[PDB]
């Protein structure tokens, strides 16, 4: 009991009819008090009335205490307000599961939706979804059944011996059910989702429009208009949602540090990567055998499933299930990256004769922030913060920082033996050294650094692959990018690269930061989408297949048909077959290139053809003013068009051609 | 060029320093070094167009021709859903036949001729009709696939399931489909195919029909699908389905044109891997339809009070109808926005509940899917303003919802993808499959014929459909004999109207007739009669047609209601609660004198009518009815009837009514002609190309088919057609719309056209005679419709100088009647064809203006002034004669070039007239605007059109508002802009406590602000009617009234989100150490000046988390979260940056920091006395000051020093020639003044005097700032207050103090300077808005003698 009582009664035996409505709502005897502690405070006198000496007739309850009026709304939320002189809403900032009391509440609410998703999923949606709809089940009576479930052995430990620990279990799983609506709305939001709805109103709406316009067909939402999640089945998106995250340490799935389940891995990014690999995977006629595309994406999927194990259960999953379900991934996935060329013109003027002279640049906007170089940007500004204050470089601390890396090289040269192979020798006589490089990685501006990515960084990205004998590769890219970073510090230092001017992680990308920001990225996940704004549109960088893109991605995978391209007879002209087959041939009809170097040459040349759109030409700064393919100008386009294929004329340099003009396309 | 030492040279544009340096290091391009790099580009874009020929798209021999070629060339850019191979057999191979295609004479040429006898047409056009009858192309681009095929296609892209297997198994087996597997039809696949089969490029373009045994059974194309099984060829396509790599096609028809008895075809083995399914159309079956924008205004084009159009009971002529239809629709209208207002609890005044308000915005982003940020936001009714994430979509969805319920008005119908009637109409032993209606015979045209009483009606064409609807009230009808469904549905009940969008005239609506019910399973499928595509000029492949079918009354059968009883009483459901579920409420308002409260019997029969025995009903009392009843066939199904009195007719009735009286203007004596006639309309082209020539033949001579030019140029000849395919439309629309209306200028006379009192008139019958050829209005603005909507067929209309610069002169000559043949030959006009490329070359990036300022027209006049050595001042504008036009295309002719192009701006800019009219024509489909910025335009548009007509303005706009009231009778139109835009402003204006940035002292604000602005060419902005300034106004003002809360009330913004940033960074580092990390804070990116977001897209599961997070961090770090909102305010003011964490700041810290109590305070404050806002408007200036609108940029050129200062600091701008531009107008005592605000270079001045005829400008502060490196647009505001900028720098401080010293010691009216608060112009319009209310203003109609 010891229940509140009302203040405008003040020292009677009446008690706080209100006071009992909060309590039962805030569900805190404490919080309670408090609130109507500040429902007595001056300001709501004067706002909402005197209800502690006059009696208020419109905003009052039985007992003469301002009412709690309770609105609940179409989706059965409920919330508790007070109603004032004004009519104005006092809101009374009730939260929903008040039972659950972590400070990272967030991912707690996660945990235990996420495994009665899994639960009702498993259950009802492990044999098909597209029948069921979540609506043949029941939600309360499945939240009832798994707490049930979850509880029998724990109340059986209770029974054994009484210790508190296990009752504070036995609650926690009764809290679980004590919310078993808001976490039943939570679930419902989860599988509606997943299967995407069909809206035939505005579709036929906007579809009129476009007609009225005259959008012809397919012209009427482009292919990059519609996001690549929605090709993703129902199906397929809850079987790619229920993936667990790898423990970073024992290598195995991690457990939920709040009710020992498995804690599974974000579907957003599980989709990205698999984009990422599966894309540009197409039906070829390779050797008269007719490739299916779900074995390449298997395959796939089985090669990163050796880099990332929190992909080795999804392969199971594609081995016990159905053909259909096969097909329905394929096409889930069967998709071509479609990646957006922006040309970006710069005028200057010369130094002295002070005439004009411009720049043309195209960038590749789709991967353009790209999850390796925006952290290489993230370096350069963390950079500036802690080495150049104001723009003065502390060539102190630099110099600090170089004596700790020759020290480390020293202390490398020093203890050498081939004697040590195994990871645990490597550790055993260089963990303090590999500390001293997170710390002056941090000191340059790596603040993200952790240790777990180091391991994977002087691993050289081999996991399964070094097994026993692995002392030597880490060493090696130990001192490697040891030695880097001295001859990068004495760039830094003696200023043959200046870091007011030129950013120097993007320097020594290839010779330390990428594999550094490579390894820092293999443990955070990225739930972004691949996507680009471009002119108030938002474009997805992932779209489904068209035949250029096929033949192209042939041409890639599967050049032998450009050998018989070159067989035919109006084929046999082809300079760009040659080219990129390596059998580039001089004015008498010989080989330019031996037999070495024609191999290699060809991978190479296939490897840099790229298929892009045009997405816009832009005077720099100003991207507001910027021309797609509609809007830009005969001249603008020429000059364009003229710089892209003279391009390759400058040494480091490559052609953009564009195609014939595809009619009114 | 000329070099410093005076050698020439050439400079290139647009080429970078890279690549020229590539050729020569110096400044200077040679003629060599010219010659160098266009000798490059030139031969290895040629090299690489001839690489692509070879790799890509293939021998161009095998294309119909070069020109033919670029036309078929995007087959290579085709995408789709590509299908799975690989798994069993051949996969990667299927079976084609090409087909001859079935190009017939009309079977009923005789009868068309007969019609057209009595069209009171002229005698060459009905030859031409005829004979365009005489060759009909049945099977355009038409193809039919068997089931098999189908079955493989819908498995192989990941869409089978185990229904469709057994809609499959049923398709297979000719079973009929029940409810359930309806949307799972076998609608014809709208793919496409392009490859290289053995180094041939085969293209296919068509419709894939699926060939159920239901449809060809009892039919003569069984014959042909029997083959396809039997000889495993999956699809079968006609020759135009290929357009390129057909084999010789394979002939299937009799010299009688009958199809062979039996069939073997030459079968064309393709490959899988390159086929895809372009578009995955869905299954619509029969539904509420939302009615063409276009068909609904082009019926008034085929209206003559010469005929007599009869409906049962009632009798129009050509006017009456108009009322008649206008009167009908803009019921409709009436009653969906009843309806709204039902929703919102409009009060007579025009004030709504809160409460309905927020409770429909909750429920809209409940069904869309929202955030729970956002709509807890909503949920708590905090007022729309203080929820900064979502104002705008708030706002968005309030006039989205008020638009769709005054405009976006429905009937009965559905989209529908046409079929060949190929060999289906005619018919061979017993047909089992198609539900035959009438006595098996061809499908007919539309032909005229006697009625009983010796009266001309059209009889509707023919039509096959799959009549969903018919299917689920009567199953087993394909069961039934045709004399039992004959005499069960009323035949007034299978008649339907079918218009194509865009309708390029009255052709493409046809009045049909249904003859046969398709299978169900081929979907969303119509078969018409066999000359259709000639009529509509429509392909095979073209987009789904729409049609609007008749609404129906059913008589359910004595068992339903008998079930349905014992189920209401069996389920205890309460004879009020069915009273409670009914809120139509049919009878309560008027038919309850007898019925009063004792009737109980007849609300349960309409509740059992219409939720439970109702097949499509939301309130689920139907689906659990049918879980154990079944329902049974209805024993008649009826067209449901309307009354005369509007009022009477709920929106079924008002529907089928609108639906009988197009029929009565379809089926006319009269309107056969409009009906029959193709929709080529060949005047305009055949000019065209007389007097320029035919560009269909072309010849590659140097090489030119490959070269990059040529193919530049093709490219924007082909994408001309894009942009003007809809303002032709719409220009074409309002012409049938307005043809009553006598608009007209009021005093100013073109010099051609149709002219009434002096004035040029506009939207008469027939155009002027030239050369003994009049041509209808209608039939030009089709013309240049079907040119531009064909544009891809045949590029001509760009031939003729006719494009977005010239359309709007073109299209007001067409509708003041100047005959088409000058049109032609004065648009075409050499020098106006060299004003257009001028104009698009001149507003490039690459080439920089000689004199920014000067206009292209400016610098054409000048060229031609020197040419012609004669001054554009002395030069007139006259009205010539053709053959001076046409001979001067023809050979030059001297004097006139001058002429023509004064002649050309005057109609510019009457043009832009007669287009402010149309833009204030389209309330019938765009409504009231999108946002309340479109709103506040339409509004100022509408005010400014009106006070031009009432001031008497000589080139104004005459009789414009007798679109929405005329003949004092409100028009469709009239009542569309009543419930939407004055609805919506009454909202706003009514309600100033919910919408602030709608509350009439924001609109006023904006007003006055642009009224302040200067428009270049010397005009004063006015009421906001530009859309940018617009913009930037709302997204400045909602910083400006935000800037007023405790919490954002922070000075030194740039420090305060530096620590903010600081203290960010420093918890990342500390959440390393213990290994748990915060959502929100983790996806913060820190740029060297701001924080935030990347502007990548993200679900609804990763909105909701990052919310989450930042609740989680509110609670843990509350100081962090507070100084991280801040920033989040002071950083990008709210609006939608490319940094914006707005939408994830939890409302409980908005609701916690009172933001209720700051927005209701703000709300009444701003209710009595706008005196608040007044500080604002320089700020805004001084913020936004790079905007060449608030600040114009004066030339330097033109400026003139001033003794003791020097230029920078304060100059002088003297009124002149070159300065007339920013004069905005005349005060009371006729003194010119000028605008307050004024950059120059990069500094920012406001006008401080006026000396005679010139004004003093003095530099002043900006405030803001701008780092794009960060994406940081800081702006700086003070509520109530006037405020000093915290960035300027301090020698910039030193030296604007020491200006004020300066101005203020020699200044003074001693001096002869006036102060500039003196001169304010002088506006006219102010007493007519003020005298007069928005209303008024729409409808006119006062009364005068
Ligand atoms: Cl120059
Ligand atoms: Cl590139
Ligand atoms: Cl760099
Ligand atoms: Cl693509
Ligand atoms: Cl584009
Ligand atoms: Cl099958
Ligand atoms: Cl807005
Ligand atoms: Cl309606
Ligand atoms: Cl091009
Ligand atoms: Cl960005
Ligand atoms: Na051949
Ligand atoms: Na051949
Ligand atoms: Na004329
Ligand atoms: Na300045």
New binding site residues.
């Given amino acids: 009991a010891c229940k509140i009582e009302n203040i405008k009664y003040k020292g009677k035996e009446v008690e706080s009819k209100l006071g009992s409505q909060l309590i039962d709502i805030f569900n805190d005897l404490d919080r309670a008090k408090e609130e109507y502690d500040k429902l007595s405070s001056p300001e709501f006198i004067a706002k909402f009335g005197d209800w502690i000496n006059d009696e208020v007739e419109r905003n009052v309850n039985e007992d003469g205490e301002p009412l709690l009026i309770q609105d609940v709304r179409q989706d059965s939320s409920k919330h508790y307000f007070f109603i004032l002189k004004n009519g104005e809403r006092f809101d009374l900032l009730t939260r929903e599961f008040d039972s659950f009391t972590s400070p990272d509440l967030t991912n707690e609410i996660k945990e235990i939706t996420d495994q009665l998703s899994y639960y009702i999923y498993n259950k009802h949606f492990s044999s098909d979804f597209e029948q069921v709809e979540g609506a043949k089940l029941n939600i309360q009576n499945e939240i009832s059944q798994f707490v049930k479930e979850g509880k029998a052995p724990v109340q059986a430990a209770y029974n054994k011996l009484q210790d508190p620990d296990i009752k504070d279990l036995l609650d926690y799983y009764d809290n679980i059910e004590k919310h078993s609506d808001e976490f039943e709305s939570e679930i419902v939001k989860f599988f509606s989702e997943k299967k995407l709805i069909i809206k035939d109103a505005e579709l036929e709406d906007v579809t009129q429009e476009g007609l009225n316009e005259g959008l012809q067909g397919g012209d009427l939402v482009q292919a990059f208009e519609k996001n690549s999640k929605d090709n993703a089945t129902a199906n397929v998106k809850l079987m790619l949602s229920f993936l667990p995250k790898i423990d970073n340490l024992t290598g195995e799935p991690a457990l939920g540090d709040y009710l020992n389940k498995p804690v599974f891995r974000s579907f957003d990014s599980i989709h990205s990567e698999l984009l990422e690999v599966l894309s540009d995977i197409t039906t070829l006629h390779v050797q008269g055998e007719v490739l299916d595309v779900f074995s390449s994406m298997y395959n796939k999927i089985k090669e990163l499933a050796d880099f990332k194990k929190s992909f080795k259960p999804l392969l199971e999953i594609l081995d016990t299930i159905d053909e259909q379900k096969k097909t329905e991934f394929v096409q889930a996935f069967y998709l071509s990256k479609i990646n957006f060329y922006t040309t970006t013109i710069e005028t200057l003027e010369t130094e002295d004769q002070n005439n004009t002279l411009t720049t043309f640049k195209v960038q590749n906007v789709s991967n353009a922030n790209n999850p390796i170089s925006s952290k290489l940007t993230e370096y350069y500004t963390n950079f500036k913060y802690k080495i150049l204050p104001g723009g003065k470089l502390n060539k102190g601390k630099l110099k600090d920082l170089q004596s700790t890396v020759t020290s480390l090289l020293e202390k490398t040269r020093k203890e050498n033996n081939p004697k040590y192979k195994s990871d645990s020798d490597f550790y055993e006589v260089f963990e303090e050294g590999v500390v001293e490089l997170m710390q002056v990685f941090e000191d340059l501006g790596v603040d993200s650094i952790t240790f777990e990515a180091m391991d994977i960084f002087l691993k050289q990205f081999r996991f399964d692959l070094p097994e026993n004998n692995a002392y030597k590769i880490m060493y090696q890219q130990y001192q490697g990018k040891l030695t880097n970073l001295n001859n990068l510090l004495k760039d830094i230092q003696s200023n043959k690269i200046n870091p007011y001017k030129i950013n120097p992680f993007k320097n020594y990308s290839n010779l330390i930061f990428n594999s550094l920001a490579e390894a820092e990225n293999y443990f955070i996940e990225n739930n972004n989408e691949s996507t680009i704004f471009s002119n108030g549109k938002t474009y997805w960088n992932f779209a489904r297949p068209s035949y250029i893109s096929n033949r192209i991605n042939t041409f890639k995978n599967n050049p032998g048909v450009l050998r018989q391209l070159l067989n035919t007879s109006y084929g046999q002209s082809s300079l760009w077959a040659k080219h990129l087959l390596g059998e580039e041939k001089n004015v008498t009809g010989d080989f330019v290139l031996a037999g070495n170097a024609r191999e290699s040459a060809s991978e190479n040349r296939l490897k840099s053809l790229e298929l892009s759109?045009?997405?816009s030409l832009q005077e720099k700064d100003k991207g507001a003013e910027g021309n797609?393919?509609?809007s830009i100008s005969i001249v603008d386009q020429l000059a364009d068009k003229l710089n892209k294929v003279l391009r390759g004329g400058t040494k480091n340099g490559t052609s953009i051609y564009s195609t014939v003009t595809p009619g009114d396309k | 060029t000329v070099n410093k030492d005076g050698n020439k040279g050439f400079h290139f544009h647009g080429l970078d320093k890279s690549i020229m340096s590539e050729y020569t290091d110096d400044i200077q391009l040679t003629e060599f070094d010219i010659s160098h790099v266009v000798s490059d580009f030139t031969l290895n874009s040629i090299l690489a167009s001839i690489e692509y020929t070879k790799l890509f798209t293939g021998d161009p021999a095998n294309y119909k021709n070069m020109v033919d070629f670029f036309k078929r060339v995007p087959a290579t850019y085709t995408n789709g859903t590509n299908l799975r191979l690989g798994l069993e057999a051949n996969d990667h191979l299927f079976d084609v036949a090409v087909l001859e295609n079935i190009v017939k004479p009309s079977a009923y040429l005789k009868e068309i001729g007969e019609s057209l006898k009595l069209s009171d047409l002229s005698e060459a056009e009905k030859k031409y009709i005829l004979e365009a009858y005489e060759d009909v192309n049945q099977t355009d681009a038409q193809a039919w696939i068997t089931p098999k095929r189908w079955a493989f296609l819908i498995s192989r892209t990941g869409k089978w399931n185990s229904k469709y297997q057994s809609v499959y198994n049923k398709i297979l087996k000719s079973e009929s489909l029940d409810a359930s597997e309806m949307k799972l039809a076998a609608q014809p696949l709208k793919g496409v195919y392009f490859g290289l089969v053995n180094n041939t490029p085969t293209y296919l373009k068509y419709s894939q029909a699926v060939l159920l045994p239901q449809l060809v059974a009892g039919t003569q194309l069984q014959s042909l699908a029997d083959a396809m099984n039997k000889q495993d060829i999956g699809e079968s396509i006609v020759l135009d389905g290929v357009k390129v790599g057909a084999t010789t096609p394979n002939i299937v028809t009799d010299e009688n044109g009958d199809i062979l008895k039996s069939i073997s075809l030459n079968p064309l083995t393709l490959s899988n891997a390159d086929w895809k399914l372009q578009q995955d159309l869905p299954v619509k079956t029969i539904k509420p339809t939302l009615l063409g924008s276009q068909i609904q205004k082009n019926i008034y084009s085929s209206l003559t009070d010469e005929a007599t159009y009869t409906i049962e009971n009632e009798a129009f002529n050509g006017s009456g109808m108009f009322q008649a239809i206008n009167d009908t629709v803009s019921a409709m209208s009436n009653l969906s926005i009843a309806g709204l207002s039902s929703e919102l609890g409009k009060d007579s005044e025009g004030k709504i509940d809160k409460r309905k308000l927020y409770d429909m915005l909750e429920r809209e982003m409940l069904d869309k899917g929202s955030a729970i940020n956002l709509l807890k936001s909503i949920q708590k009714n905090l007022p729309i303003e203080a929820m900064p994430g979502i104002k705008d979509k708030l706002y968005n969805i309030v006039f989205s919802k008020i638009n769709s319920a005054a405009v976006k008005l429905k009937t009965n119908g559905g989209s529908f993808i046409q079929l060949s009637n190929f060999g289906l109409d005619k018919q061979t032993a017993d047909a089992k499959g198609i539900t035959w209606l009438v006595e098996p015979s061809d499908l007919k045209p539309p032909v005229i014929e006697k009625d009983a009483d010796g009266k001309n009606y059209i009889r509707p064409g023919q039509i096959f459909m799959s009549h969903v609807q018919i299917a689920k009230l009567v199953p087993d009808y394909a069961k039934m004999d045709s004399k039992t469904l004959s005499s069960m549905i009323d035949p007034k009940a299978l008649r339907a109207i079918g218009y194509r969008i865009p309708n390029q005239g009255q052709s493409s609506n046809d009045p049909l007739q249904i003859v046969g019910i398709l299978p169900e399973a081929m979907g969303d499928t119509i078969v018409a009669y066999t000359e259709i595509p000639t009529k509509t000029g429509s392909d095979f492949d073209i987009d789904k047609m729409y049609v609007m079918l008749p609404n129906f009354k059913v008589e359910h059968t004595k068992k339903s209601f008998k079930l349905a009883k014992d189920y209401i009483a069996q389920n205890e459901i309460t004879v009020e609660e069915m009273y409670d579920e009914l809120e139509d409420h049919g009878f309560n308002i008027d038919d309850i004198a007898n019925g009063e409260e004792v009737t109980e019997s007849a609300i349960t029969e309409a509740f059992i009518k219409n939720h439970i025995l109702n097949s499509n009903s939301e309130l689920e009392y139907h689906n659990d009815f049918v879980k154990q009843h079944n329902i049974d066939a209805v024993n008649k199904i009826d067209f449901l009837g309307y009354s005369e009195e509007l009022h009477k007719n709920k929106s079924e009735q008002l529907q089928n009514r609108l639906f009988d009286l197009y029929w009565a203007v379809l089926t006319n004596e009269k309107t056969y002609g409009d009906l029959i006639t193709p929709i080529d309309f060949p005047h305009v082209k055949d000019e065209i190309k007389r007097v320029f020539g035919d560009n269909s033949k072309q010849t590659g001579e140097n090489l030119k088919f490959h070269d990059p030019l040529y193919q530049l140029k093709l490219k924007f000849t082909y994408a001309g057609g894009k942009s003007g395919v809809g303002i032709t439309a719409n220009m074409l629309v309002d012409h049938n719309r307005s043809k009553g209306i006598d608009m007209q200028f009021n005093q100013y006379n073109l010099g051609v056209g149709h002219t009434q009192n002096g004035n040029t008139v506009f939207d008469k019958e027939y155009s002027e005679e030239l050369n003994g050829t009049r041509f209808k209005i209608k039939d030009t603005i089709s013309a240049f419709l079907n040119a531009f909507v064909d544009n891809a067929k045949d590029p001509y209309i760009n031939d003729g100088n006719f494009n977005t610069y010239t359309s709007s002169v073109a299209f007001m000559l067409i509708r003041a009647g100047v005959h088409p043949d000058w049109i032609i030959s004065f648009i075409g006009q050499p020098v106006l064809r060299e004003l257009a490329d001028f104009t698009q070359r001149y507003e490039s990036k690459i080439i920089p203006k000689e004199d920014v300022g000067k206009s292209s027209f400016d610098i054409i006049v000048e060229k031609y002034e020197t040419i012609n050595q004669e001054s554009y001042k002395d030069a007139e504008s006259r009205a010539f004669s053709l053959d001076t036009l046409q001979e001067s295309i023809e050979v030059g002719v001297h004097g006139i070039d001058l002429d023509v192009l004064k002649t050309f701006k005057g109609f510019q800019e009457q043009a832009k007239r007669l287009n402010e009219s149309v833009q204030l024509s389209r309330f019938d489909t765009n409504g009231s605007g999108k946002n309340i910025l479109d709103l506040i335009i339409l509004k100022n548009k509408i005010k400014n059109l009106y006070v031009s007509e009432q001031t008497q303005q000589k080139g104004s706009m005459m009789n414009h508002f007798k679109k929405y009231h005329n003949n004092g009778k409100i028009t469709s139109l009239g009542t569309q802009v009543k419930n939407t835009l004055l609805f919506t402003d009454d909202i706003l204006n009514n309600n100033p406590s919910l919408f602030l940035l709608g509350s009439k002292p924001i609109q006023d604000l904006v007003n006055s602000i642009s009224n302040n602005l200067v428009d270049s060419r010397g005009g004063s902005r006015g009421l906001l009617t530009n859309e940018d300034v617009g913009k930037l106004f709302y997204k400045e003002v909602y910083k400006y009234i935000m800037a007023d809360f405790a919490p954002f009330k922070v000075g030194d913004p740039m420090a305060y989100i530096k620590d903010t940033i600081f203290d960010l960074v420093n918890y990342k580092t500390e959440d390393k150490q213990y290994d748990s990390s915060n959502f929100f804070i983790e996806n913060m990116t820190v740029y060297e000046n701001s924080f935030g977001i990347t502007n990548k897209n993200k679900s609804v599961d990763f909105q909701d988390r990052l919310y989450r997070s930042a609740y989680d961090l509110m609670m843990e770090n509350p100081e962090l979260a507070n100084k991280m909102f801040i920033s989040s305010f002071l950083m990008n003011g709210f609006e939608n940056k490319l940094i914006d964490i707005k939408e994830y700041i939890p409302y409980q810290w908005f609701l916690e920091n009172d933001i209720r109590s700051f927005i209701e305070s703000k709300n009444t404050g701003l209710k009595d006395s706008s005196e608040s806002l007044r500080s604002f408007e320089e700020q805004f200036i001084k913020n936004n000051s790079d905007s060449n609108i608030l600040a114009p940029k004066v030339s330097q050129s033109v400026i003139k020093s001033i003794k003791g200062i020097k230029s920078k600091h304060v100059f002088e701008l003297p009124i002149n020639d070159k300065t007339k531009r920013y004069i905005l107008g005349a005060t009371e005592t006729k003194e010119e003044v000028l605008p307050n605000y004024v950059k120059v270079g990069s500094d920012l001045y406001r006008l401080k005097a006026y000396r005679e005829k010139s004004g003093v400008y003095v530099r002043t502060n900006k405030l803001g700032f701008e780092d794009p490196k960060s994406f940081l647009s800081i702006k700086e505001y003070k509520f109530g207050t006037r405020t000093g900028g915290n960035f300027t720098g301090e020698l910039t401080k030193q030296e604007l103090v020491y200006t004020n010293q300066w101005v203020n010691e020699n200044i003074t009216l001693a001096n002869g300077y006036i102060s500039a608060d003196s001169r304010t112009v002088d506006n006219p319009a102010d007493k007519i808005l003020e005298q007069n209310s928005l209303e008024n203003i729409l409808f006119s109609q006062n009364n005068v003698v």
């Fill in positions: 759109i045009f997405n797609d393919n509609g």
